[PDB]
Amino acid sequence: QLIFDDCVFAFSGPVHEDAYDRSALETVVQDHGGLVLDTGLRPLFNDPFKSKQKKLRHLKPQKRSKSWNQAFVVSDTFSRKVKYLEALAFNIPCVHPQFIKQCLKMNRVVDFSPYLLASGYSHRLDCTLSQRIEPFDTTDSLYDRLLARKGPLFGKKILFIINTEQGQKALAHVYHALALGADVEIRPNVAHLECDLILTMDGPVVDPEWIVECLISQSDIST
């Protein structure tokens, strides 16, 4: 068939000028049967804010994902670009572009491992960490895999106290929290509510950076 038959791709960056020919690569992948999601990976999941009511249940895989078995985000290196962070959240491999080129050389989808970028840089620890990716069991569709995924923040109940301009960046964080298997509830005020932690923008209670920390270390850094 076509090598990237059942693979979904997203491209991020390049983080560094002319680090890779994104325009070109995107083509190669399409030319070889691969699907290319230009906006990132959100398509593979529900929109939590469709009927943004009660309030809000973590992400579930849209049935479409049943039609593929592998996904990658391509980047020349790790970043905090939103496609990267989304990948990080969904536990999809961020891989260096060479991975694709290698795939064409082996005329097959090779193991992405040797091309697995670090997850990112932690200010909490002042270091770069590694990604940790539940292997692709190629009998389970992305849908299967993505739905069995219990996030690192699975179960955790989060209150976010805040849909226009800045709010978009706010919601981005809620999304990631959700993606990370957590249950977010959006209030204007705390009051007397029950919660595992509270997420206010800027700066118990913590700031979005905490989430990025969780994204990179794939862990509940509060514990």
Partner: peptide
């Protein structure tokens, strides 16, 4: 796509 942002950077942070």
């Amino acid at each position: 796509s942002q950077e942070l």
